[PDB]
């Protein structure tokens, strides 16, 4: 079946910029291509239809273009509310949605503020030991965290979670948790989480000992 592909996986722009999102079909779809917007809340909206027709009630900031197999969405000037994920849709032969492309706002570079936390006494009594490490308010979104126990790197038992770009300061934040058994945690003394980010060649080191 016809496959839609939006090379644009994640796009970063500035307010007032003119942004263009691409979409490509496996074959000529004869302009039967619509564009949708999905806000962070999950709401889905119709922007353009029949390649270039602007839907009623949609800001004239949006427009579509293209023909054959290549199509694209353009925004005259970017505003805060346009920060969302955009999908294209072909309807020449059944229905197919593009892979999707998300927009994010540019801001000044920021090194992550790192903090590390030892297992609570409450969890320890339960036979469990979780070590937490926060990497807050950084930029860009690309970041790498590494855990070390008594100087030895450890991959297993590490779970991470990432927040979406902040709607106020446009930064990103990450949380990394190292879960071990109470016994394992009590075998070693020092626990370290290191953060690797664009803002510096040397990693940000946070550690503690028992």
């Amino acid at each position: 079946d016809i496959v839609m592909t939006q090379s644009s996986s994640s796009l970063s722009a500035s307010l007032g910029d003119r942004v263009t999102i691409s979409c490509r079909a496996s074959q000529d779809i004869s302009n039967y291509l619509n564009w949708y917007q999905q806000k962070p809340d999950g709401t889905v909206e119709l922007l353009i239809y029949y390649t270039s027709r602007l839907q009623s009630g949609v800001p004239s900031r949006f427009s579509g273009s293209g023909s054959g197999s290549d199509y694209s969405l353009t925004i005259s000037n970017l505003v805060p509310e346009d920060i969302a994920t955009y999908y294209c849709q072909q309807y020449s032969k059944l229905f197919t949605f593009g892979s999707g492309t998300k927009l994010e706002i540019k801001r000044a570079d920021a090194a992550p503020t790192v903090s590390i936390f030892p297992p609570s006494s409450e969890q320890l009594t339960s036979g469990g030991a979780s070590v937490v490490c926060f990497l807050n308010n950084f930029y860009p979104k690309d970041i790498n965290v590494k855990w070390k126990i008594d100087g030895s790197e450890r991959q297993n038992g590490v779970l991470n979670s990432w927040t979406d770009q902040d709607s106020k300061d446009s930064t990103y934040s990450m949380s990394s948790t190292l879960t071990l058994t109470k016994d394992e945690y009590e075998r070693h003394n020092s626990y370290t989480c290191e953060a690797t980010h664009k803002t510096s060649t040397s990693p940000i080191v946070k550690s503690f000992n028992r």
Binding site: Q55, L94, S115, F117, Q123, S130, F134, W162, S173
Partner: protein, 222 residues
């Protein structure tokens, strides 16, 4: 005007089967096609299929034949989709949208969508979360501020409401998306205040898990 209301969050065990609805209103239910689209966590939109309430015609995305079954009830202006042989790959958000019947022109699209019905396929049973305070250690300070934390572990299903100091401390807060850990959800949250305010002024974590009517308050102690 044109309204599309979908059923609420559904929880199901693997192998089982479920049936969710989409209630349309504000237009001739039998004049449009009712389509269903799927979207997994952090994934894109995937077309499932559609049905014409008028005569009952249906078109499916080959991939879903044998997994999804579309139906409708003109008398109740409601669309139904049934998913069978549920698996983990079936956990996602499902949307319903409409598409016009051909009558010339070029106005063919998915102009209206439902809010989406979340489906979670799991074998886990209702489980109240454990709440652990995260007290800071030398180095957890930056600028003139200190960072505190709260760890919510081993609960099911989502969601949990986490606030700081009953809701009065909302700025400088970072509550992260829950992740799986042995079929049970684990979640984290940090709060950053002026180093002078702590611990002279207590900081407390508040967790609420509706599913188990659980409420836990964990005061962070040095």
């Amino acid at each position: 005007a044109v309204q599309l209301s979908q059923s609420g969050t559904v929880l199901a065990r693997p192998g089982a089967s479920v049936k969710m609805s989409c209630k349309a209103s504000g237009y001739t239910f039998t004049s449009y096609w009712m389509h269903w689209v799927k979207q997994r966590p952090g994934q894109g939109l995937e077309w499932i299929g559609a049905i014409y309430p008028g005569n009952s015609d249906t078109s499916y995305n080959q991939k879903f034949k044998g997994k999804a079954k579309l139906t409708a009830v003109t008398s109740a202006s409601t669309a139904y989709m049934e998913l069978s042989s549920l698996t983990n790959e079936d956990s996602a958000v499902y949307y319903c949208t409409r598409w016009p019947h051909y009558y010339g022109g070029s106005r063919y699209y998915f102009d209206y969508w439902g809010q989406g019905t979340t489906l979670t396929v799991s074998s886990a049973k209702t489980t109240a979360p454990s709440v652990y305070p995260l007290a800071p250690v030398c180095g957890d300070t930056t600028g003139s501020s200190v960072t505190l934390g709260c760890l919510v572990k081993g609960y099911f299903p989502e969601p949990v409401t986490l606030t700081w100091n009953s809701g009065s401390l909302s700025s400088g807060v970072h509550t992260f998306p829950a992740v799986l850990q042995s079929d049970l959800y684990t979640l984290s949250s940090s709060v950053t205040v002026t180093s002078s305010t702590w611990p002279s002024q207590s900081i407390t974590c508040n967790v609420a898990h509706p599913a188990s009517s659980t409420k836990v308050d964990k005061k962070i102690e040095p």
